[PDB]
Symmetry: C2
Subunit: 533 residues, 2 copies
Amino acid sequence: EDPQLLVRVRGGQLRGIRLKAPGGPVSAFLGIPFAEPPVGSRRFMPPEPKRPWSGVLDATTFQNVCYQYVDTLYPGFEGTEMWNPNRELSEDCLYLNVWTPYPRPASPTPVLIWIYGGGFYSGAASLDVYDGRFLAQVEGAVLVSMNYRVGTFGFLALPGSREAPGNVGLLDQRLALQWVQENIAAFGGDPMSVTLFGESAGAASVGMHILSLPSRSLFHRAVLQSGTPNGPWATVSAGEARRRATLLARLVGCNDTELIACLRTRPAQDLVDHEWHVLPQESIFRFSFVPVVDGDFLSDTPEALINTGDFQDLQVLVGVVKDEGSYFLVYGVPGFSKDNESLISRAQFLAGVRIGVPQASDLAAEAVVLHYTDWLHPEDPTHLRDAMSAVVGDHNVVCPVAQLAGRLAAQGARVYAYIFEHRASTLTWPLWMGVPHGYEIEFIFGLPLDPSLNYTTEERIFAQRLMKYWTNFARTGDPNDPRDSKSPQWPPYTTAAQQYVSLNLKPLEVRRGLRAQTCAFWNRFLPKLLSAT
Amino acid sequence: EGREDPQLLVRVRGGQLRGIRLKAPGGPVSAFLGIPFAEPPVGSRRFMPPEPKRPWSGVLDATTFQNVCYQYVDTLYPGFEGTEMWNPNRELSEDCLYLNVWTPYPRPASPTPVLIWIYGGGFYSGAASLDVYDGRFLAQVEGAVLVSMNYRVGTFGFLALPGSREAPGNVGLLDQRLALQWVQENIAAFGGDPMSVTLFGESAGAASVGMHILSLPSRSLFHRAVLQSGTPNGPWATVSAGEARRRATLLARLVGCNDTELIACLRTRPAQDLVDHEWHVLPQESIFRFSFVPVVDGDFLSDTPEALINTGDFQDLQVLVGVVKDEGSYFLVYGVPGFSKDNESLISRAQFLAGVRIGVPQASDLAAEAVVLHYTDWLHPEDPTHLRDAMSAVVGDHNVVCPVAQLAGRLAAQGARVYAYIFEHRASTLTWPLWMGVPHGYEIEFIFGLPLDPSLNYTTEERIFAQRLMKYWTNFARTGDPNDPRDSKSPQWPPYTTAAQQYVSLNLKPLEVRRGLRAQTCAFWNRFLPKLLSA
């Protein structure tokens, strides 16, 4: 019975497990319950604190993955399977994971809290790419990650009702953050230095914690990788949420109370089976059950809240990968596949656009096409393919990120921005997809430090750089290495200079303007257009 | 005759002419100036189609430029050479339908390709007698036969009550066509070849050339065409029948005047009173808009130029078209607040938003918004230097560069052989400020070879440059190809095509080939803006 692996938290005692990281051991406490299982009459409801337990809770293994749709586009393909659940599905899934240095930090160590992505309909804290042992061993970080409910279980809402108020998946995250405040000191973590980071919908979640008052006392700094609370996919209105719920109810054979009671009797997979059938249009990068503007968790739209908020007290790191959109094309756009070069025609490009920008009027869709067409080579299939990706990536991630960065900087926040440009040597998706959505994560978490993974030595050096930026940001709100003159420095993003850095194998290079012209089109012009036409 | 220079006596259909022997740098040329080609369109003939000049008796003296057509005189910067060079240099008169001929001296042996110049001036001004249009250099150095004609401008040339008998519209264009007919009948008397006639013109002259291309009756009067910084399509070169009617009747009201009675009253007004009110009938505060221009009458112009270029067959057409580096700059000082020739015209973002409304006068709020969004530099949305240059670009792109791109594009896609250029050399003698770059109209003096005149103070490179340009233009006139057959060592000027979109830079350096005539931005003006109009 190793005393390092024994911890007492408010709920009782836990036993962790000593894990091996390439350069030493780490203590891991996996599958720790932070809420009462949200099952039965608790489905769709806010989470409740876990009841205390007797004896020593076994925390040596990952708990179940929250019930969710499982990707079947390319069965058995590593590129898709790496995001698929790697433990049993169950509605009983509200557990978190802690990694710390072995032995446990002598002084209170900055805490990093990871919130996974997966479009709010999927994901799990137990995936290999979220392995916290590297950051724990190399950087001496305390790293936390929670499961939170996704899809219907996490975001189905009949706004105003008592039994499906919406946003309970975000309340799961918040409960887990509360748990960190109350318990993390027992592991050596410093509750007074907590940094949230997350990718895609996890980044959007981080963004919503920034914009929700009760969350603000649970962390001090934030990192948003390739996702934002503002933008086209991360939220829905009360009315559109209500619409999607009652439609799903109808689809599975079901006054709010009675509607929800009948939904509560449905086996989990019955709900998932119809999840994708409630979207208003044929689309990509669009998800049926996501956070809802309830006037509660989110008092107004994220757009409104970032425009009017005071962010003086906030430090943020935000960024995008080089090819945000490519991934999503093979999930809905005719002409695209991981198996060929997806060279498309002009007609297929105009088709792709109505799908990639599903809420666009005819005129707006024409605007997009004409903006993104290269008029020197209007019909070149290679350009058209790359343009289709750019449209999807720009509309859904890059421009929403440029918008957020700008509002935050303009309203007092300390902001750092990046674009991640290195394509992993181990990547299984075709070359034409470039650096796809989500493929910076394995580098931030430091997976290349594991020799059995076959990353190149330059990549291993790269990963170490990124872990430094992230953990330095966690420690100080500034990703710059304090023990390093010469670099050059990573400057804050401001509305004046608009500086950000490229992250890749070469040293930091400072650039200005994050797709400035193109994001002016999306952020300034298109709104004016659609609100008229 | 008896003791006159026997080489200067010529007979044309209307009678005998005596020309004058002029000195050009490299030798003498023959000039026949102020030849009448129409009955004076005065009195009851105001607003009417021209009638062919009736024969005269004796020897008409043709040694001096004739009257300039009655027009507005520019007074923005009185005494300033930059404006005065474009002002009338002979007496104003409604009796102004005369043309000019320069030829080698002695006149050519075999029949020589003919160049016909059509001056610009917004359809409200201009004259064939200006210094920058001096035909002596092309005649002497290239052996060209050069013809230029006066044509009515302003109300006199373009006031229209469409459908009426007394003011049918486009009479200024019919003056041009009458002069083309005169060339067909008479130019062989000077050694000119009526079967090789190339039209060239700049600004409204260029738009005029484009309208002769689109007008069937003019099509048997010429064989090749050059359009410099102007097009028959675009926002300023034509008005609708309704808009012309509206402007004519408003102008009538302003001067105290059933179409017949209205026009009859207009014919009693002194020329100057019409000129004094012509700017007052424009629909909005604007620049690069002119009150009385060609009208889509369904006669001379069977449909809008846009419709005609979109659907015409242009197999038989050889055309040279181009633009200067800074088409819009000149126009800014004539009405965009913040702009002047006498300072750097650094402007604010607010002055930019206002300038856009004036420079794109027909835009709705949303459309103006699109323009401001597109042209703003979003790394430096507030920089006064960038904003100044963007304002100029907005005006140049909207009025010239994108209409020319559209024209070259449709003509090529539909059979025509098209050559395209951008002219980038700023004259060492320019009197406009540096901020204006290479302004609208300032290639003309190079095409006509003025830098060959030692007394004008051009540099030796400019002289050599002028000679190259004169070669391109005359080669194109001779063969429909600007390239020199002998000289293959010199870089070649490829045709412009929809597939490759190639065009050349004209400057002190050897031809450089480029692709895409503001392709992205012109996609905005030519493909998107019109649709933002169906909404």
